[PDB]
Chain A
């Protein structure tokens, strides 16, 4: 929160929930889709 943006990683949207929520659901969606695709693709 306060000790995360002190060097060259300073941006405007870091603790806003509306950005990290869609980023987290996109990451989890690609993780679940990759797991499902590797499960339905292999051994075939």
Chain B
């Protein structure tokens, strides 16, 4: 038990050790180890299985009932200032650790068969193991300096994961835009860390909390400076994750392989921006104005993503904007005071979002088997039709995911969504009704995606484009089916979506007594009933609009021209965001030169 907790530090080291072993030999020979594709992946799979078993053992020991462990040591000491680094063991840390390890293991199990036609196979597994090791290091980190260290590591490895094929020109600018988008939040977190070390200097979180409490009690500073420092702290997860000012990096980072976005969107870059505010909750509980502006910008970006993701012809961009909308929900709930409910909503959202991205990647791979190497004719929705009879279990899994993201009967996201709406209705009625309309607006385009992707008649390609399927892949005429590789995680990730709905009920409320903040109501039922009513409204609108077809959207597009054309591109966001900034920077650098 106690040696098991003393030796609980090599778990993020062994995937890093495997990545070092792979990368030391991949650049030394690059012709001998290039033939070895399968056992070099089997070794990484065995290391990830050992890490998953260690994570399950630590989570079982934490749920059995113990004390939160800590281990710190001196790192770059000085005469007066001493910096301590190490690892903390928390039940929330193990709860995120099992999620990260299970998601990485299922992504590697998908990429075992997804990359069976690409010559680059060993660098993909090495970079995925490096991403998993950096995320496992980011989970267990009690000091904010190593939070910044693993933040930079996640940003660098995501910059490596975006540019993989180095053939397309969109992914060239996408990684360079995403790195400076992360650099804006890194600048904000650096200013926040500088201000926090200027005021405080006790490196613990609770020590910083009660030191700031004693510095607020005995009058030494102004609360406006603490508000500016809290805004600078929040500015990190604004630009790293998706928010109102900085969210245009995510459709650029969408372009690439599907196991890349399956790790980026699930619990690694999405969960880290929430976990930074989760570790800074006693600092943020002192003043409420930063909590109100956090909830306001979360409700604003949730309202923005729902109106963007309607008229989108790409499946992965609409999935990413729905992820932005759910980020708005969980950020607004964390600003209100739905902390444990926001963490449970993040867990549920990652649980169905990884499965939904794997199903979308299976549909994309089937359309790659049908339609050739043109990506714009492959990710479009005008060609999707009649995919239910060819993909029965994949279509059923996508239906389960698209129904659990709504949850008009009692399901996984149902209780978490009603707890979020109850917290906002306790906070503010206007944001509650805004999120109530947003919850129907997201179900509208969700069921639009479900009724345009699988159900309907089979639609072919017009003869203006090329019609061949022998460019650089296999030869197949009918839409085929993945035999055993891609079908396994789609049925593994089904039973958590059933289990966490009954395990996270508000009656027993085990998640509240398991994860707590460090320090029966009928109105809940009628807000839940209003959510079911607007979900049924969204279902009955999006059903016959695309299956029956009597409210045809062409007459609706001819009806409202400017409201459609303003949100058609994205929302007229990027053409104002990049243009004058890049031109001003170019003119300033030209004048300086």
Contacts and interface: CB of A to CB of B under 8 A. Distances in A.
Interface stretch (B279-287, B504-512, B584-592): B584-592
B82 to A, nearest CB: 28
A8 interface: yes
Nearest to A20: B591
A8 B591 contact: no
Contacts of B586: 8-9, 11
Interface string B116-133: 000000000000000000
Interface string B553-593: 00000000000000000000000000000000011011111
A32 interface: no
A34 interface: no
Interface of A is mostly: loop
A31 interface: no
Interface string A1-42: 000100011010010000110010001000000000000000
Nearest to A14: B590
Interface of A: 4, 8-9, 11, 14, 19-20, 23, 27
Contacts of A4: 593
Nearest to B593: A4
Contacts of A20: 591
Point out which of B587, B589, B591, B593 has the most chain A C-beta atoms below 10 A from its C-beta.
B591
B588 to A, nearest CB: 9
A14 B592 CA distance: 11
A9 B587 CA distance: 8
A37 to B, nearest CB: 21
7 contacts: A8-B586, A9-B590, A11-B590, A19-B591, A20-B591, A23-B591, A27-B592
Nearest to B586: A9
A35 B125 CA distance: 53
A4 B587 CA distance: 13
B245 to A, nearest CB: 25
Contacts of A23: 591
Nearest to B583: A11
A11 B591 CA distance: 11
A31 to B, nearest CB: 12
Contacts of A27: 592
> Would you list the 3 A-B pairs with minimal beta carbon distance, nearest first?
A23-B591, A9-B590, A9-B586
A21 B593 CA distance: 13
A9 B592 CA distance: 13
Point out which of A4, A8, A9 has the most chain B C-beta atoms below 10 A from its C-beta.
A9
A14 B591 CA distance: 8
Interface string B155-168: 00000000000000
A32 B512 CA distance: 59
A27 to B, nearest CB: 8
Contacts of A8: 586
A43 to B, nearest CB: 19
A4 B593 CA distance: 10
Nearest to B590: A9
Nearest to A27: B592
B589 to A, nearest CB: 8
A4 B586 CA distance: 13
B117 to A, nearest CB: 36
A41 to B, nearest CB: 18
Nearest to B589: A9
A10 B230 CA distance: 41
Contacts of B589: 9
B394 to A, nearest CB: 44
Interface in B489-543: none
Given A9-B586, A11-B587, 11 more contacts: A4-B593, A8-B586, A9-B589, A9-B590, A11-B586, A11-B590, A14-B590, A19-B591, A20-B591, A23-B591, A27-B592
Nearest to A26: B591
A28 B593 CA distance: 14
B395 to A, nearest CB: 46
Contacts of A11: 586-587, 590
Interface string B242-284: 0000000000000000000000000000000000000000000
Nearest to A5: B590
Point out which of A4, A19, A23 has the most chain B C-beta atoms below 10 A from its C-beta.
A23
B580 to A, nearest CB: 14
Contacts of A14: 590
Nearest to A8: B586
A27 B589 CA distance: 12
Nearest to A23: B591
Contacts of B592: 27
A21 to B, nearest CB: 11
